[PDB]
Design a protein around this ligand. Structure first.
Ligand SMILES: [Mg+2]
Ligand SMILES: [Mg+2]
Ligand SMILES: [Mg+2]
Ligand SMILES: [Mg+2]
Ligand SMILES: [Mg+2]
Ligand SMILES: [Mg+2]
Ligand SMILES: [Mg+2]
Ligand SMILES: [Mg+2]
Ligand SMILES: [Zn+2]
Lengths: 56, 63
RNA sequence: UUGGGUUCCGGGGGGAGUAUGGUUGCAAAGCUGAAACUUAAAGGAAUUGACGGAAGGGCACCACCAGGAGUGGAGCCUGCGGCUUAAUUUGACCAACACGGGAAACCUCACCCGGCCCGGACACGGACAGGAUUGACAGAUUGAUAGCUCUUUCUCGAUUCCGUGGGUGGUGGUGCAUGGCCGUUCUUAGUUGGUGGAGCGAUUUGUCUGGUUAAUUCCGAUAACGAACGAGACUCUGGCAUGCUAACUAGUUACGCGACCCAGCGGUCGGCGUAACUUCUUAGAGGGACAAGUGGCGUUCAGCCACCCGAGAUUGAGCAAUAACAGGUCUGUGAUGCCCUUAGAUGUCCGGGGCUGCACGCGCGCUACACUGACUGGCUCAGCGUGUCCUACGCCGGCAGGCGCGGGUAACCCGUUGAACCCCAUUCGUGAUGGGGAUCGGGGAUUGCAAUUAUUCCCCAUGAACGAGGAAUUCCCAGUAAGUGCGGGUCAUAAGCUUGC
RNA sequence: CAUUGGAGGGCAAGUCUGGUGCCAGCAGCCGCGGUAAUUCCAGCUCCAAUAGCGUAUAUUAAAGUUGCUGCAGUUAAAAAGCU
């Protein structure tokens, strides 16, 4: 929760329009729980997904 | 069902393939190797009927 | 910030307004009224979902209507259950079942029957140059030309071996420990914060009475305001440009020869060569359509209907939200936790078998039941796309095929891809027929290490059900359904499949 | 030679290690355990109060859950049918 927030802050401070950090897996316990950190704009559909967002 | 034992080796002593007499004698007891690969070193074997080269896999059926 | 007077009455739920006793009543019953035992909740109000054989709106050929083609009946192909087996490896039950790109001869491959191998790093200790150890012909042995073992003796020479320690491998287990990727709810229009307001709060408003739209699409209303995603835009593609850029790896026309026909600055020529050119071919750049125009309808808004003009007045896809699901995949992974095994191995190789086994049930398909046809000729038309394997031509063979020569790493060669149905002419004649081609005998080629449980291919014979398919049910509205053939994937051999044309 | 109880939450104190696998067991209450148990059985640690500390039962406060101070009685338990 602390590491993802600092990466989230470091992207928006660096001059980005919007970013998503998604961390899925065994976080607390043995059940798989996803965790998604969003701020700003984020497109999902269409051709501009091909060159406005980069994924890793 | 009993397993198969492996090839237990025979564990012999020194070679002793050399005769020596009258204070300095040359005698090649086991046979020669006509191959130029193992010549002057490797002997041949001595079975009950044949001689055999342990390297070049060559035997002579002396009948 | 708890006191006007006064009556009755409740104390978790059940047992239970039951049992007993008294009393009232003709009776039915009323009144009064326990306990043992049992139990961690029962309950009230409100909120959000879910569901309703509740009502309003609206929508979809994975829904119906009007229909079409069917499937379900038949034979076969192939997948799943079951049975059987030494083993018939296994995953999956709308959203599993021609699925795992899963068309398995061996390999694949896990399963079975057997036989080798170490590919057990490294660390320590034991051994050991008087030698650690390694490989072997010939016999015995073995499915085996595995020195695997045994007889037998020769060979390498520190690489190894023995012992604990510790690693490594695994298409082993676990998808209910997970990653990733898919699929689905969910092809519909839906979802969310900020600040403000309303509530003790969960929450709500925003995100709506109404109109409109494919759409939470807009107009408009309004304790909301301003935004965000999805929709839309966008991308590819379809359809038009006698305008542009451009062409010996694209053509056309003109012309020059050349064949042939019957005389012309005639007719045909995918005969040959070069002059202008881009119409046709290719593929770039721009253009074009916006509900723009007209008329209606509509709050005159949003929009809708019709018509003109036009190639076109909704072409088809791809991408695709929040929240999820114990959806699938550990058998895609040197993605992976934990567990199991780890040398007589669940590692790995080799050989053989199995994955095809057949009282039976189901799913996706194929070929048919014929005359709107089959047969035998004749004639004449594609488009994607692939190729170091694709193939031209010449000989040989009746056929599958063979043998020679060439071309193409490809707008260059195959290839002007001379495709089917169709079209025209024949024979048949309503008879399970010359419809149908299952089953099966015999021969012939090819691929491959190997064709048996027929790999395919070809020939000759054999000639089964089937005369339109019960109850059921699938898919579909325009170049669509259906008929019809051709590529690609898989592929040494190769399509009844799938994906494209 | 300092015990007695504990360590999921109430409630001070561990997501330690080993065993067990809805078994044995714990647990006042909610609960835990069906193969990675923060709860069982043990070791390690830690906490609490300490020459004392658990446990059973009566009882008082907590209890404005008996209400004089001070409770409720529309729908949660409940105002008699009416005078
Ligand atoms: Mg009072
Ligand atoms: Mg009570
Ligand atoms: Mg406690
Ligand atoms: Mg008391
Ligand atoms: Mg008090
Ligand atoms: Mg009370
Ligand atoms: Mg009541
Ligand atoms: Mg009353
Ligand atoms: Zn020799």
């Amino acid at each position: 929760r602390r590491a993802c927030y600092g990466v989230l802050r470091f992207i928006m401070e660096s001059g980005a329009k919007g970013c998503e950090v998604v961390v899925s897996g065994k976080l607390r316990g043995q059940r798989a729980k996803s965790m998604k950190f969003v701020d700003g704009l984020m497109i999902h559909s269409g051709d501009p997904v091909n060159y406005y967002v980069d994924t890793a | 069902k009993k397993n198969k034992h492996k090839r237990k080796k025979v564990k012999l002593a020194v070679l002793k393939y050399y005769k020596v007499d009258e204070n300095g004698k040359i005698s090649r007891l086991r046979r020669e190797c006509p191959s130029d690969e193992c010549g002057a070193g490797v002997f041949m074997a001595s079975h009950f009927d044949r001689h055999y080269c342990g390297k070049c896999c060559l035997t002579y059926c002396f009948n």
